Amino acid sequence: INDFDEVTVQSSNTTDEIIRDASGAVIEEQITTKKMQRNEKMIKTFVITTDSDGNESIVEEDVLMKTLSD
Amino acid sequence: FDEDYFGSDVTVQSSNTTDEIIRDASGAVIEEQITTKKMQRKNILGKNEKMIKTFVITTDSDGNESIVEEDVLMKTLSD
Amino acid sequence: FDEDYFGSDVTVQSSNTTDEIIRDASGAVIEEQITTKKMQRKNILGKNEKMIKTFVITTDSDGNESIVEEDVLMKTLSD
Amino acid sequence: INDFDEVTVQSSNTTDEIIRDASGAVIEEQITTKKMQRNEKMIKTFVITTDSDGNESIVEEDVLMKTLSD
């Protein structure tokens, strides 16, 4: 499921920030978009860093939540 | 043999799993299991650029979803 | 100006924040705010190796902690 | 706080797995260690990837939890 490099889209906006890192100046273009679609709650998180060499590094974090007792 | 991602689209380089128990205000008890994977691979403006998509999906046993996406393109202007 | 990490030990390349509202079995209501940062920088066996530490700290307003650590050294043996 | 590259240590064990990725063979050495020390709960997560070029990439995820009402 690398589909992540691509269903009601309830929002979308695109800001522009200019940052100084621990060195030089970087422009940054922030599209930020809320979508939606189809005893536990599943909150999965993904952070995909890609670079000018096609190289992708993902970091997933699944936070599953069941309710036990009481 | 221990693990094989030769078939997969990516390669899980690591995995972890912790459990949180949440007794709440109602003493009601919640288990939270937290898997944390680090995977590398997929191999398209390049040059001076870097993509950082962040996703935050929420799901229920009904079928309903709730995707939040954040794309951050970084063109470095000088150094 | 927008952001400056010139002073810091690292550079936050991105940030996000979502809120989850959890009504539970007792209708009790929980807000969960989820900040997700991606930062790069720190710059020691090398050669064919890669470190992947995973941390999972839990804290309370008392002061108590609960660190889980996972180190994964990857020496590639062949290709 | 790059101190992460370094308090009761309640556990520690070190396994060895051999993996095949989406290509070749990788050894992996898994130290896995539980420590501890000092209306909300704070669960911070960190995943630090370092490489043979001193290059570190971190990914933090803070999951704060207050209880509102009921």
Whether the Cβ atoms of residue C41 and residue C9 lie closer than 8 Å to each other: yes
Interchain CB distance below 8 Å, C6 and A22: yes
Distance of CA D68 to the CA centre of its chain: 30
Specify the residue for token string 């979803």. Answer: B65
Q: Which residue of chain A is at minimal alpha-carbon distance from C35? A: A45
Residues of A in contact with D61 (CB under 8 A): 45, 61
Token couple for D35:
């420590």
The bridge status of strand C68-78 relative to strand C50-60 is antiparallel
Q: What number of CA atoms fall less than 13 Å from residue A25's CA on the CB side?
A: 7
Task: Tell me the three state secondary structure of residue A21.
Answer: coil
Which of C6, C57, C68 is the mutation pick for testing A, counting most A CBs within 10 A?
Answer: C6
Structural domain that includes position B79: 1-79
CATH number at residue B78: 6.20.280.10
Identity of the amino acid at A66: K
Residues of B in contact with A42 (CB under 8 A): 57-60
Q: How many domains does chain A have?
A: 1
Chain B and chain C share a number of CB contacts under 8 A equal to 55
Q: DSSP per residue over D10-56, as a string?
A: ---EEEEEEEE-SSSEEEEEEEEEE-----EEEEEEEEEEEETTS-E
